[PDB]
Amino acid sequence: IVGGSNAKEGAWPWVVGLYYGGRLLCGASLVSSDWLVSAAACVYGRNLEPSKWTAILGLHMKSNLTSPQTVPRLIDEIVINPHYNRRRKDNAIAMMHLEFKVNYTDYIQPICLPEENQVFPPGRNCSIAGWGTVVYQGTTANILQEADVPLLSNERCQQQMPEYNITENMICAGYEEGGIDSCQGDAGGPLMCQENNRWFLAGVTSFGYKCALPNRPGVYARVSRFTEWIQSFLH
Amino acid sequence: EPTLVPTPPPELPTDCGGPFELWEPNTTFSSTNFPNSYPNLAFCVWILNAQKGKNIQLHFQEFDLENINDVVEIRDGEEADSLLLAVYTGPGPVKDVFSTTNRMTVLLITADVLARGGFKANFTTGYHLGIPEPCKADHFQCKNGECVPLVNLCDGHLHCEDGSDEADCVRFFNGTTNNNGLVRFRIQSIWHTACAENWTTQISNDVCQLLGLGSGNSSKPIFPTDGGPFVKLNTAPDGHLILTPSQQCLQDSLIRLQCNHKSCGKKLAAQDITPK
Ligand SMILES: *[C@@H]1O[C@H](CO)[C@@H](O[C@@H]2O[C@H](CO)[C@@H](O[C@@H]3O[C@H](CO)[C@@H](O)[C@H](O[C@H]4O[C@H](CO)[C@@H](O)[C@H](O)[C@@H]4O)[C@@H]3O)[C@H](O)[C@H]2NC(C)=O)[C@H](O)[C@H]1NC(C)=O
Ligand SMILES: *[C@@H]1O[C@H](CO)[C@@H](O[C@@H]2O[C@H](CO)[C@@H](O[C@@H]3O[C@H](CO)[C@@H](O)[C@H](O[C@H]4O[C@H](CO)[C@@H](O)[C@H](O)[C@@H]4O)[C@@H]3O)[C@H](O)[C@H]2NC(C)=O)[C@H](O)[C@H]1NC(C)=O
Ligand SMILES: *[C@@H]1O[C@H](CO)[C@@H](O[C@@H]2O[C@H](CO)[C@@H](O[C@@H]3O[C@H](CO[C@H]4O[C@H](CO)[C@@H](O)[C@H](O)[C@@H]4O)[C@@H](O)[C@H](O)[C@@H]3O)[C@H](O)[C@H]2NC(C)=O)[C@H](O)[C@H]1NC(C)=O
Ligand SMILES: *[C@@H]1O[C@H](CO)[C@@H](O[C@@H]2O[C@H](CO)[C@@H](O[C@@H]3O[C@H](CO[C@H]4O[C@H](CO)[C@@H](O)[C@H](O)[C@@H]4O)[C@@H](O)[C@H](O)[C@@H]3O)[C@H](O)[C@H]2NC(C)=O)[C@H](O)[C@H]1NC(C)=O
Ligand SMILES: *[C@@H]1O[C@H](CO)[C@@H](O[C@@H]2O[C@H](CO)[C@@H](O[C@@H]3O[C@H](CO)[C@@H](O)[C@H](O)[C@@H]3O)[C@H](O)[C@H]2NC(C)=O)[C@H](O)[C@H]1NC(C)=O
Numbered sequence: 453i454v455g456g457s458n459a460k461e462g463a464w465p466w467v468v469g470l471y472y473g474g475r476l477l478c479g480a481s482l483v484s485s486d487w488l489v490s491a492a493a494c495v496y497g498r499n500l501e502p503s504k505w506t507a508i509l510g511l512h513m514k515s516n517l518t519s520p521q522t523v524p525r526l527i528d529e530i531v532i533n534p535h536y537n538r539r540r541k542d543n544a545i546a547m548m549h550l551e552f553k554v555n556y557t558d559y560i561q562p563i564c565l566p567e568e569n570q571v572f573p574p575g576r577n578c579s580i581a582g583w584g585t586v587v588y589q590g591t592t593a594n595i596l597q598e599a600d601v602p603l604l605s606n607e608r609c610q611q612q613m614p615e616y617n618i619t620e621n622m623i624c625a626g627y628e629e630g631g632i633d634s635c636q637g638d639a640g641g642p643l644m645c646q647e648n649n650r651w652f653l654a655g656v657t658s659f660g661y662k663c664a665l666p667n668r669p670g671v672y673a674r675v676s677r678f679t680e681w682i683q684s685f686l687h
Numbered sequence: 688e689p690t691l692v693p694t695p696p697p698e699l700p701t702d703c704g705g706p707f708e709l710w711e712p713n714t715t716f717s718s719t720n721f722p723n724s725y726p727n728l729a730f731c732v733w734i735l736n737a738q739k740g741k742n743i744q745l746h747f748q749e750f751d752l753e754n755i756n757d758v759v760e761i762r763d764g765e766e767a768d769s770l771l772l773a774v775y776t777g778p779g780p781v782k783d784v785f786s787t788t789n790r791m792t793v794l795l796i797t798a799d800v801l802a803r804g805g806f807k808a809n810f811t812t813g814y815h816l817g818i819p820e821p822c823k824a825d826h827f828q829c830k831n832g833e834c835v836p837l838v839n840l841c842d843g844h845l846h847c848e849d850g851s852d853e854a855d856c857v858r859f860f861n862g863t864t865n866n867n868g869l870v871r872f873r874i875q876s877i878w879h880t881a882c883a884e885n886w887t888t889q890i891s892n893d894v895c896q897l898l899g900l901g902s903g904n905s906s907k908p909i910f911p912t913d914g915g916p917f918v919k920l921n922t923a924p925d926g927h928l929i930l931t932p933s934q935q936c937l938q939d940s941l942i943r944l945q946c947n948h949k950s951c952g953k954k955l956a957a958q959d960i961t962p963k
């Protein structure tokens with residue numbers, strides 16, 4: 453987001469937007485025909501009114517959605533991960549269900565959930581995207597932006613930010629010299645890394661100390677430890 | 688010299704709540720002051736104790752707060768781990784909350800403005816309050832508690848009352864990975880193979896579809912390692928599959944399938960080529 457580059461149409465078909473009251477608030481990703489994944493932090497205290505959430509698929513530009521590529525959708529059921537406390541900011545994953553199935557096309561693709569016994573060593577480049585602000589004091593009203601950030605270990609993250617209970621359920625990423633940090637604005641953006649011509653899901657955007665500050669890596673929720681929970685009701 | 692006018696500032700550090708632990712004899716309670724308002728920037732925790740093996744049912748007689756800045760959290764743990772259970776906020780009546788443990792935690796979080804009346808609770812204890820009546824006459828136990836002798840277990844219809852019996856009686860015994868394993872089917876109570884003597888590619892594709900996977904990749908048999916109650920599977924004119932029980936048979940062969948992974952998020956978009 454911050455310091456990134458503008459993306460083209462169809463670059464990331466699995467990135468979808470979520471609206472609430474006519475304003476963009478949080479991001480989401482497509483998992484199956486009628487399921488979505490998003491950070492549980494942004495969807496909190498609003499789970500009693502599912503009808504007020506509007507789902508947009510194939511979102512590329514915020515100018516007008518009259519083009520035959522945006523399919524409006526509504527959320528029928530919202531599921532929040534039981535292991536959440538809003539104190540340690542640990543395990544914030546939420547699941548959203550669409551009212552009707554959406555046919556797969558060229559501009560609509562799902563994400564590939566990681567399997568068990570998969571190890572991603574630090575230092576591998578992974579891509580990020582979102583519609584968040586880029587000036588840290590404004591908003592973004594343009595096409596989707598993309599950027600690439602390295603991977604950092606848990607010990608390095610604890611050493612750089614000794615102010616939170618990092619534990620082993622969190623993923624940290626970001627350059628040591630700063631410059632690019634997509635933890636502001638869009639907190640529902642997915643963390644995507646590829647493996648031999650197939651893009652998987654690596655993490656879910658979470659809280660952060662402050663974007664672009666040196667030695668301030670981001671926070672992302674682990675997905676390999678929640679694959680079974682998602683597949684339980686993936687259907 | 689003093690810039691601040693001689694008026695009392697808010698000056699409300701910490702929480703300054705109320706009672707923390709209660710028991711059965713006292714049920715109804717209000718947070719701070721139900722008739723008028725509650726203090727801002729407060730965080731009070733109530734612990735509902737109960738006898739071992741008994742559930743707790745909570746009800747609210749009145750519940751009128753603000754918008755969404757203030758929320759109420761109910762947890763069944765607060766010892767080593769807890770679950771969000773149910774969270775209610777905003778004006779309007781709320782439903783009762785059931786807990787599977789013998790200890791319930793209630794939390795209140797408020798902002799610095801927009802004080803409201805508050806809420807009052809209704810403490811009730813019992814046995815299996817959130818669990819429906821167990822099934823009788825050896826009927827099938829469903830998710831919603833409905834009892835039916837035999838209208839389920841992967842029948843060729845949806846006669847079950849719930850209508851959500853989408854589970855399939857197919858699983859990989861032993862195997863080498865998730866996508867590789869011996870195919871077994873359970874007609875009524877016993878899992879067994881499908882007699883791949885007349886196995887074809889269409890049957891493999893149908894089986895892979897039933898397992899939420901791709902198409903038929905490999906269908907090479909090895910030998911009948913298991914001596915289970917073999918039943919016969921054969922093609923049908925329609926889109927279904929017919930499984931004929933043919934137990935007590937010799938000269939058979941098992942099924943070894945490796946269904947390909949489903950198509951997923953590969954960048955199949957016809958991106959233009961930049962002449963640079
Ligand atoms: C997602 O994909 C699914 C399937 O992949 C798709 O379902 C299709 O919906 C269209 C709706 O327009 C179906 O087309 C109709 O089919 C019915 C079948 O009886 C016909 O009656 C319709 O009209 C015919 O008959 C009329 C009689 O007077 C004729 O006048 C007319 O000329 C037609 O011949 C019409 O053809 C289509 O059959 C299904 N697909 C399948 C495989 O059944 C769905 O629309 C897609 N989109 C969404 C949002 O789900
Ligand atoms: C899934 O995998 C399991 C294990 O991988 C498998 O169970 C195994 O079945 C085989 C036969 O199909 C068993 O092999 C026999 O086991 C007995 C009892 O353990 C042994 O006594 C046998 O040894 C014979 O040979 C010895 C040397 O000559 C003699 O001294 C002896 O008396 C016997 O004659 C033979 O090894 C094997 O033990 C089990 N394994 C376990 C852990 O039980 C199962 O069949 C597989 N299922 C499917 C559907 O593939
Ligand atoms: C929403 O945003 C979209 C961007 O993703 C817009 O799509 C494209 O918008 C451009 C705007 O310049 C269009 O380019 C023009 O297209 C017209 C053809 O449409 C008109 O054609 C005749 C005149 O020839 C007219 O009589 C018709 O009534 C049409 O109004 C060309 O004539 C122009 O020279 C120019 O090239 C793209 O065509 C358009 N593409 C698509 C696929 O829509 C979209 O327009 C935006 N929607 C709104 C309401 O603003
Ligand atoms: C909710 O129900 C509870 C019962 O399950 C109530 O707790 C009991 O309330 C009665 C009513 O006052 C108390 O009776 C008093 O007991 C004291 C003796 O306890 C004093 O000494 C001990 C130390 O030994 C000290 O810890 C206590 O704090 C007291 O200072 C008598 O002196 C009094 O005359 C009176 O009889 C019970 O003591 C009390 N139970 C316990 C275990 O303390 C509770 O009050 C109910 N909630 C409300 C808001 O009323
Ligand atoms: C992950 O992405 C980073 C992007 O930050 C990659 O870093 C890039 O690495 C290349 C190879 O060393 C750098 O190229 C350099 O170009 C200068 C030009 O004069 C040359 O003198 C150097 O010898 C070197 O070839 C590049 O500057 C650098 N940064 C970029 C592209 O922004 C990294 O290679 C990627 N892969 C990893 C970390 O495994």
Ligand SMILES: *[C@@H]1O[C@H](CO)[C@@H](O[C@@H]2O[C@H](CO)[C@@H](O[C@@H]3O[C@H](CO)[C@@H](O)[C@H](O)[C@@H]3O)[C@H](O)[C@H]2NC(C)=O)[C@H](O)[C@H]1NC(C)=O
Nearest residue numbers: 540542606607609610611613614615616617618619620767
């Ligand atoms: C992250 O979370 C972990 C686990 O919650 C924290 O580790 C815990 O830290 C406390 C210190 O406040 C440890 O208590 C101490 O244990 C030693 C054991 O010998 C004892 O001698 C001390 O008197 C004290 O009681 C605790 O053992 C330790 N582990 C657990 C499981 O609680 C950690 O502090 C948090 N923060 C960071 C930056 O890691």
Ligand SMILES: *[C@@H]1O[C@H](CO)[C@@H](O[C@@H]2O[C@H](CO)[C@@H](O[C@@H]3O[C@H](CO)[C@@H](O)[C@H](O)[C@@H]3O)[C@H](O)[C@H]2NC(C)=O)[C@H](O)[C@H]1NC(C)=O
Nearest residue numbers: 564646647648649650651947948949950951952953954955
């Ligand atoms: C995993 O990585 C390997 C890298 O070796 C990928 O293999 C490469 O796949 C592409 C197609 O996706 C091949 O391009 C095609 O090559 C043929 C000639 O073999 C040419 O006629 C076509 O027009 C097209 O350019 C590429 O050659 C191939 N690389 C090698 C060394 O064979 C593979 O696709 C990746 N994904 C997997 C295995 O799922």
Ligand SMILES: *[C@@H]1O[C@H](CO)[C@@H](O[C@@H]2O[C@H](CO)[C@@H](O[C@@H]3O[C@H](CO)[C@@H](O)[C@H](O)[C@@H]3O)[C@H](O)[C@H]2NC(C)=O)[C@H](O)[C@H]1NC(C)=O
Nearest residue numbers: 714715744745746747748782783784807808809810811812
């Ligand atoms: C919340 O607290 C109130 C305070 O007592 C509880 O009200 C009591 O509820 C029971 C069960 O509904 C009532 O007993 C029933 O009365 C009806 C007649 O209205 C009778 O037909 C039934 O056979 C049964 O005996 C009881 O009368 C009622 N108390 C009063 C004073 O009317 C309420 O149950 C609590 N809610 C929960 C969920 O615990």
Ligand SMILES: *[C@@H]1O[C@H](CO)[C@@H](O[C@@H]2O[C@H](CO)[C@@H](O[C@@H]3O[C@H](CO)[C@@H](O)[C@H](O)[C@@H]3O)[C@H](O)[C@H]2NC(C)=O)[C@H](O)[C@H]1NC(C)=O
Nearest residue numbers: 647648866888901902903904905906944945946947948949
């Ligand atoms: C069953 O699934 C496996 C997935 O591992 C399929 O393996 C893949 O097969 C294709 C086609 O043979 C391989 O493409 C390569 O194309 C180049 C083009 O010259 C050729 O030189 C290679 O020898 C190879 O054929 C692909 O690399 C391979 N994937 C892996 C990871 O090895 C297999 O094809 C599937 N079975 C059927 C019947 O499709």
Ligand SMILES: *[C@@H]1O[C@H](CO)[C@@H](O[C@@H]2O[C@H](CO[C@@H]3O[C@H](CO)[C@@H](O)[C@H](O)[C@@H]3O)[C@@H](O)[C@H](O)[C@H]2NC(C)=O)[C@H](O)[C@H]1NC(C)=O
Nearest residue numbers: 882883884885886887919920921922923924929930931933
């Ligand atoms: C599984 O595959 C085997 C192998 O093809 C099938 O066994 C063949 O069965 C046919 C059936 O014989 C019938 O004979 C009638 C006259 O008596 C005739 O009117 C009818 O059309 C049919 O031909 C037999 O001819 C073959 O000789 C059998 N093949 C072998 C190798 O024994 C078997 O039916 C298949 N089972 C299925 C599809 O469920």
